[PDB]
Amino acid sequence: LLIAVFNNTFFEVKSISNQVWK
Amino acid sequence: LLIAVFNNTFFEVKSISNQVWK
């Protein structure tokens, strides 16, 4: 069930991580 | 298959849970 939480919470975290790395 | 069942009905469940808890 926690897989569902990980799925819906990837796009925004990915964008934020990209910005932080940049 | 059952992963997608929880996956397709997640965001509304989370919002309703937040409303009910508050």
Cβ distance B6 to A4 less than 8 Å, yes or no, reads yes
- CB crowding A1-22: b at 16 or more within 10 Å, else e: eeebeeeeeeeeeeeeeeeeee
DSSP string, chain A: -HHHHHHHTSHHHHHHHHHHH-
Which amino acid, A2? L
**Cited resolution, angstroms:** 4.7
Cβ distance A8 to B10 less than 8 Å, yes or no, reads yes
To 5 degrees, how large is the angle CA A7–CA A13–CA A16?
160
Experimental technique, in short, is: cryo-EM
Chain A, residues 1-22, CB within 8 A of chain B, namely 1, 3-5, 7-8
